Amino acid sequence: EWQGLMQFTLPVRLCKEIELFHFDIGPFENMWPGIFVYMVHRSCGTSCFELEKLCRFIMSVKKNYRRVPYHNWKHAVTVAHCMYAILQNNHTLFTDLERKGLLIACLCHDLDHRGFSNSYLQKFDHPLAALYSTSTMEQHHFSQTVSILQLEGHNIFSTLSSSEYEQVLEIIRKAIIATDLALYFGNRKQLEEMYQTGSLNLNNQSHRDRVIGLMMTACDLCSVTKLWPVTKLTANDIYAEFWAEGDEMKKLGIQPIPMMDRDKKDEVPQGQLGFYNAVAIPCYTTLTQILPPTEPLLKACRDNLSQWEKVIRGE
């Protein structure tokens, strides 16, 4: 398969549309691997990786996403595309290494997800929770990334100096860890403070790591920034996973939280309203303040919030 990927060319119509935040990859499944190649080439340059290695890496990444309702290969590519659009719109704020690192980190950020939350694994003493006591799945996702990199002919970072190889793995590690939404709340609070006091400094590495973290959250959640019908269908996939986790809990005699309880579908519109107000809107608001060209993400999120409000009022 990776050999066919090498001759792929993005159709011209898509070349225009792919640059836009609202682009939905959904209708183009056969093209997703080629879309990632395209994005890496446009953002990082056509000789950034050896094509054969990049194509082998991409195909192995795809193979290592499971056929679960939401945390699947489609999700990986959707998140990578949102990152592409953020980077393209803020290109010179980030180094070559950061752009490479972040695109790869986005593609890999949910590798081998089994459709269960960190809370579930920790509460029910899964072996991954023994290995990774905090940010359990996210450490596993980074573990999986390194594991794929070290496969025969898969090492896309082979030409880097050791120093730069270390830097990029560290960029990738931090970015993947930051997708643990438990970490987002504190991150966003610190950044909002820094922005209000006028103290945010991108040349300050700790400030920089925080901005990158927020970008990762923004990308991870971007299904809430698509057109309404797309956002609604994605919500169905997200809840399919939540409910399947809740069902496992009920078998072990434990009441799930409302969002994981399929007997509480009525509260979904209000659940979505609550998530947009407490998580999504704040995320894209802070992002827009730090990186103004990302405003369309906030606008789109606001549009979908409005749609959920309509659902609540009776439509």
Ligand X SMILES: COc1cn(-c2ccc(-n3cccn3)cc2F)nc(-c2ccnn2-c2ccccc2)c1=O
Partner from Zn ion, its own copies, ligand X, none contacting 181, C-beta within 5 to 8 A by type: ligand X
Q: How far is CA 106 from the centre of its chain?
A: 5
Q: Which of 106, 136, 87 is nearest to 217 (CA)?
A: 106
Given 65, 275, 284, 308, the residue binding ligand X (CB under 6 A): 275
Let me know the angle formed at the C-alpha of 258 by 256 and 260, rounded to the nearest 5 degrees.
60
Size of the site for ligand X (CB under 6 A): 12
Our finding on whether 271 is near its own copies (CB under 8 A) is yes
- b/e sequence 267-294, b meaning 16+ C-beta within 10 Å: ebbebbbebbeebbbbbbbbbbbbbeeb
Task: Estimate the share of the chain in helix, then strand, then coil, as percent rounded to the nearest 5.
Answer: 75, 0, 25
Nearest approach, Cβ of residue 233 and ligand X (Å): 12
Of the candidates 71, 81, 113, 141, the residue annotated as catalytic is: 71
In the numeric block, the tokens 């966003």 are attached to: 188
Answer yes or no: is 220 a known binding residue: yes
Answer yes or no: is 272 a known binding residue: yes
Work out the burial of residue 205: count CB atoms within 10 Å of its CB; fewer than 13 is exposed, 13-18 middle, 19 or more buried.
exposed
Give the 3-state secondary structure of residue 120.
helix
Segment near its own copies (CB under 8 A); pick from 109-117, 160-168, 217-225, 266-274: 266-274
Q: Which of the residues 224 through 253 are near ligand X (CB under 6 A)?
A: 224, 238
Tell me whether residue 71 is one of the annotated catalytic residues.
yes
Our finding on whether 306 is near its own copies (CB under 8 A) is yes
Work out the burial of residue 66: count CB atoms within 10 Å of its CB; fewer than 13 is exposed, 13-18 middle, 19 or more buried.
middle
Structure token digits, residue 151: 């496969």
Our finding on whether 110 is near Zn ion (CB under 5 A) is yes
Give the span between the Cα atoms of 41 and 35, in whole angstroms.
10
Give the span between the Cα atoms of 108 and 71, in whole angstroms.
11
Our finding on whether 110 is near Mg ion (CB under 5 A) is yes
Our finding on whether 94 is near ligand X (CB under 6 A) is no
Residue list, annotated binding site for 3',5'-cyclic GMP: 71, 272
Residues forming the site for Mg ion (CB under 5 A)? 110, 179
Residues annotated as binding site? 71, 75, 109-110, 220, 272
* Residue ranges that bind ligand X, judged by CB under 6 A: 117-118, 181-182, 221, 223-224, 238, 259, 271-272, 275
Positions marked catalytic: 71
| Residue ranges in contact with its own copies by CB under 8 A | 13, 17, 22, 26-29, 227-230, 232-233, 270-271, 273-274, 276-278, 281, 285, 302, 305-306, 309, 312-313
